[PDB]
């Protein structure tokens, strides 16, 4: 079977312009495990992006947390770009400070 990733882009702590924080992209509910996630800053891939060890939920779907340090500002746009077998092209979710 195949399950498409659910994607959440959010920060570790509430976003405050100018204050150092962590940009997170949590992908979950997917199957199989192969997946490609990019944290983006104004459309460009961020290089210092770490991630959690592959694990899965009670229903066998996988989940991964990709994260990077970042200092929000009002001008900078952040996003998560995810590609999985269930997706035709990569799906891009923009970080919404209120989500």
């Amino acid at each position: 079977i195949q399950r498409t990733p659910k994607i959440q882009v959010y920060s570790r702590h509430p976003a405050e312009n100018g204050k150092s924080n962590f940009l997170n992209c949590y992908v979950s509910g997917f199957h199989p495990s192969d997946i490609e996630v990019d944290l983006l800053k104004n459309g460009e891939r961020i290089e210092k992006v770490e991630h959690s060890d592959l694990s899965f939920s009670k229903d066998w779907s996988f989940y991964l947390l990709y994260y990077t340090e970042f200092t929000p500002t009002e001008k900078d746009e952040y996003a998560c770009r995810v590609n999985h077998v269930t997706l035709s092209q990569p799906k891009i979710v923009k970080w919404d400070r209120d989500m």
């Binding site: 570790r12 997170n24 949590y26 199989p32 694990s55 066998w60 779907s61 996988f62 989500m99």
Partner: protein, 276 residues
């Protein structure tokens, strides 16, 4: 009951790209404490939480060996499984397993677990009695017949009732400052006008541990289950979790809504409302 230890193993074949990758991550509740990855430059059992590091050299060696051997066992299992399903050697497949125990506050076994899923579908599971199996199809019945013949359940039971419960008790003691600590959610309600007619009320729960939580919205004391948007509880990156629940309400009616929060780190459940 209050605690659980669990191992999440994923073995995935990749024809043309080497031997199936095997990864095992160990957890105590929602705290990962170890990981083993056959794709690591030097695969070995490695700490992922401060409280397991103090465990001696022989601990790491023994578990490293258990994981290398499980890598092999799961590789042979994927071969067998391909045969049970008459599948080609060309496709990629995944064998997953979850095993562990749940203990009560006094540390007594509440229940044991040992189940497998092939390509995301349940395949076989050790029943709660820790003596019989439930096979999902005719291929699993082959695994069941083999397991019954070799008296495997007895081995898993001995592990689940003894070793698992004992390690869990030791881990809980060594990491009691965090493992035995529930962090209550920090909650608040935000309000986002959608139009002149409606606004979203989002109820937040942040910084909580463990992940288990219930957020619900009531309009006039009536649960709004069908009208509530609930995001999946997500990791913050600092061990804690976050979750929100939102409801679209008519302007001027925000006070008829209350958000209810239940978390084990809360003595009494909370009720909040948007506070302008």
């Amino acid at each position: 009951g209050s605690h659980s230890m669990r191992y999440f193993d994923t073995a995935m074949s990749r024809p043309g790209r080497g031997e199936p990758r095997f990864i095992s991550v160990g957890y105590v509740d929602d705290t990962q404490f170890v990981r083993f990855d056959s794709d690591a430059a030097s695969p070995r059992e490695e700490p992922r939480a401060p409280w397991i590091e103090q465990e001696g050299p022989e601990y790491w060696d023994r578990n490293t060996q258990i994981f290398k051997t499980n890598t092999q066992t799961d590789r042979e299992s994927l071969r067998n499984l391909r045969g049970y399903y008459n599948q080609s050697e060309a496709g990629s497949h995944t064998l997953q397993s979850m095993y562990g125990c749940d203990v009560g506050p006094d540390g007594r076994l509440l229940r044991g677990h040992n189940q497998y899923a092939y390509d995301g579908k349940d395949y076989i599971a050790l029943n709660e009695d820790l003596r019989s199996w439930t096979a999902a199809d005719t291929a699993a019945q082959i695994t069941q017949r083999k397991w019954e013949a070799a008296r495997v359940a007895e081995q898993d039971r001995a592990y689940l009732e003894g070793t698992c419960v004992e390690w869990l008790r030791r881990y809980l003691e060594n990491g009691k400052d965090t493992l035995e600590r529930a962090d209550p959610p920090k909650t608040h309600v935000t309000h986002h006008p959608i139009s002149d007619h409606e606004a979203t009320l989002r109820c937040w729960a942040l910084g909580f541990y463990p992940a288990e939580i219930t957020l619900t919205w009531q309009r006039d004391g009536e649960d709004q289950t069908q009208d509530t948007e609930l995001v999946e509880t997500r990791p913050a990156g600092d061990r804690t979790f976050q979750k929100w629940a939102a409801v679209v309400v008519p302007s001027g009616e925000e006070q008829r809504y209350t958000c209810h929060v239940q978390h084990e780190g809360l003595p009494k459940p909370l009720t909040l409302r948007w506070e302008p």
